[PDB]
Amino acid sequence: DTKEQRILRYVQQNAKPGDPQSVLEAIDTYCTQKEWAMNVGDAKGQIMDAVIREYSPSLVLELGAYCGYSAVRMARLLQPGARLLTMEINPDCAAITQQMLNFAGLQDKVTILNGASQDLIPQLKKKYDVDTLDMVFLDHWKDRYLPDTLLLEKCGLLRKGTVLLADNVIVPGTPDFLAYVRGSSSFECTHYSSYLEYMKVVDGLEKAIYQGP
Ligand SMILES: O=c1c2cc(-c3ccc(F)cc3)cc(O)c2ncn1CCCCCn1ccc2cnccc21
Ligand SMILES: [Cl-]
Ligand SMILES: [Cl-]
Ligand SMILES: [Mg+2]
């Protein structure tokens, strides 16, 4: 088996079914004690929780699911009837993510979109019935952060106040995205310094609130 399968099995065997917090704790325990993995982790996760609670978004798009950690983290804090769409290019990871969400009891709040962001973003309006997004969590290929932000805008998916929250802006890093949003009058930006998941290595999140054309 794969690392990702091992993580899922550990959750199934050490967390309580239907209890998202127990699922997060199990993942973070496994990844601290047994095998590192690229989940957002608890340090940056606490910042995400604070942001989610501030905005109470109705419709969230996540770019990059992996094993479902961040999807569980966000979905557990959504209000009744609020929804998360999460895009995952790797089909084996899509399947882990769906199983993770199922175990957590969050499957009614979350939809997986299978494919690449550059192919799926232009389908959101017509196939997934999206008007505009309230929040976007970027956690996919670093070279796609900037082009997908620009694509979201082109497709009319951003509104005044849409919150972009980006993982890994320091490590591995997203220099073009950071330079762009920080230099643009169309975004209001804030950097949240933190640590790489499971590691004593500095990383951070960037929040960039869209302000219109
Ligand atoms: O690579 C990383 C990563 C690496 C490290 C990391 C740090 C330090 C290290 F030393 C090593 C790795 C730490 C992290 O937190 C990471 N988070 C996310 N990702 C992106 C994973 C692959 C996304 C593929 N993908 C998923 C949906 C989707 C849609 N369209 C296109 C592509 C798409
Ligand atoms: Cl994650
Ligand atoms: Cl952590
Ligand atoms: Mg990440």
From Swiss-Prot:
One of its GO terms (biological process) is response to risperidone. Binds 1 Mg(2+) ion per subunit. Mg(2+) binds at D139, D167, N168. It comes from Rattus norvegicus. It is an enzyme of class 2 (transferase). S-adenosyl-L-methionine binds at V40, E62, S70, E88, I89, G115, A116, S117, Q118, D139. This is Catechol O-methyltransferase. Its cofactor is Mg(2+). Residues 1-213 are extracellular. Keywords: Catecholamine metabolism, Cell membrane, Cytoplasm, Lipid metabolism, Magnesium, Membrane, Metal-binding, Methyltransferase, Neurotransmitter degradation, Phosphoprotein, S-adenosyl-L-methionine, Signal-anchor, Transferase, Transmembrane, Transmembrane helix. The chain holds residues 46 to 258 of 264 of the full protein. GO terms for cellular component: axon; cell body; cytosol; dendrite; dendritic spine; glutamatergic synapse; membrane; postsynapse. The N-terminus is blocked. One of its GO terms (molecular function) is magnesium ion binding. Belongs to the class I-like SAM-binding methyltransferase superfamily. Cation-dependent O-methyltransferase family. The keyword Magnesium applies. Its EC number is 2.1.1.6. Substrate binds at K142, N168, E197. It catalyses: a catechol + S-adenosyl-L-methionine = a guaiacol + S-adenosyl-L-homocysteine + H(+); 2-hydroxyestrone + S-adenosyl-L-methionine = 2-hydroxy-3-methoxy-estrone + S-adenosyl-L-homocysteine + H(+); 4-hydroxyestrone + S-adenosyl-L-methionine = 4-methoxyestrone + S-adenosyl-L-homocysteine + H(+); 2-hydroxyestrone + S-adenosyl-L-methionine = 2-methoxyestrone + S-adenosyl-L-homocysteine + H(+). Catalyzes the O-methylation, and thereby the inactivation, of catecholamine neurotransmitters and catechol hormones. Also shortens the biological half-lives of certain neuroactive drugs, like L-DOPA, alpha-methyl DOPA and isoproterenol. Signal peptide: none annotated.
